[PDB]
Amino acid sequence: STGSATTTPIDSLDDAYITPVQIGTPAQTLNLDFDTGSSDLWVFSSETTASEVDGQTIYTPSKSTTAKLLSGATWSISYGDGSSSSGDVYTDTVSVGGLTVTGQAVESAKKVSSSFTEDSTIDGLLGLAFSTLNTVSPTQQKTFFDNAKASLDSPVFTADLGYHAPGTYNFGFIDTTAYTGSITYTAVSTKQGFWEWTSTGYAVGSGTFKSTSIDGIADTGTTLLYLPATVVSAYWAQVSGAKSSSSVGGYVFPCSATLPSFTFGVGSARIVIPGDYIDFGPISTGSSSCFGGIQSSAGIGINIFGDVALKAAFVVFNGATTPTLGFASK
């Protein structure tokens, strides 16, 4: 089997991407944030505290003839941005782009933190990291991909995120029309539950490539590119007036600037992030200070190849017995 679904930016900055997902019988379609940095499929629901729902579409398990309470199971998750959610668990039929999994754990939110409430466009998350990170207790549950894998034509999914435009998540096949050149595959460590890999270096603009190993994660659920402070300083030093602002929370730059590109290495191959992809617009409405799309990972503990980096590539998440990642230009 295969599946193919379009993923759409939630706003004009590509802060996140939403993909429609069918849950239950009859189908209830929710727009979920596919997140290769986490491993829970959770949704706003009829159980979510009413004051914490503000425009999201909810899953109502009582209206699904295939929903079953997973008795005694609870979940609770905190994300790197300080947001969180928790609740109980149903199993139900879940379909993405024509690919159907029966018995998928659908984690129903009883509580969500303010940033989720405040984002009316995201009805929940669909985790695509390794199932070892799934938070369901006392019986850990499998991701949608893990449940689907055995049925797929090939044990892979691909992320093809657009810049200010829709893109595609495919399951079970690699669309050879969706990228240019060849796909370069690189090793993955699953030890922390992430799609963790080592980039071979970077360049700023037209500058020379610096060969240096940068361990990090391919994370579709993180907006920006978070890299070591040395690398990030070297980038922003090429932008007149750019500075790190403790009050804003990262590097800012004059909105009048034209940003240089940023290249990252995948083995001997190179992925070029155009400068425009690094512009996240005014820090507050009407400001002439703009927020940078490359930020330091120093306070995180891991480097994160988030959407800024991934949307410059066609990315293969290869879930073969030994997982690997593939990157191609597009």
Domains of the chain: 5-174 (2.40.70.10), 175-330 (2.40.70.10)
Technique behind the model: X-ray
**Å resolution of this model?**
1.0
Breakpoints of the chain, after residues (C–N > 2.5 Å): none
CA 258 – CA 72 distance, rounded (Å): 55
Q: Which residues pair with 317 in a beta bridge?
A: 157, 325
CA 213 – CA 197 distance, rounded (Å): 10
Here the tokens at position 104 are 């998928």
Here the tokens at position 74 are 């609870």
Please give the C-alpha separations between residue 134 and each of 40, 65, 141, 263, in angstroms, as whole numbers.
Answer: 5, 25, 6, 33
DSSP 112-133: E-HHHHT-TT--EEEE-S-GGG
Here the tokens at position 41 are 């499929």
Q: Which residues pair with 325 in a beta bridge?
A: 186, 317
Which residues have CB under 8 Å from 182's CB, separation 6+?
269, 328
Exposure pattern of 160-192 as b/e (b: 16+ CB <10 Å)?
Answer: bbbeeeebbbbbbbbeeeebeeebbbbebeeee
From the list 86, 193, 47, 58, the residue with the least C-alpha distance to 129 is 193
Query: CA 138, 139, 145: angle at the middle one, nearest 5?
Result: 140
List residues with catalytic annotation: 35, 199
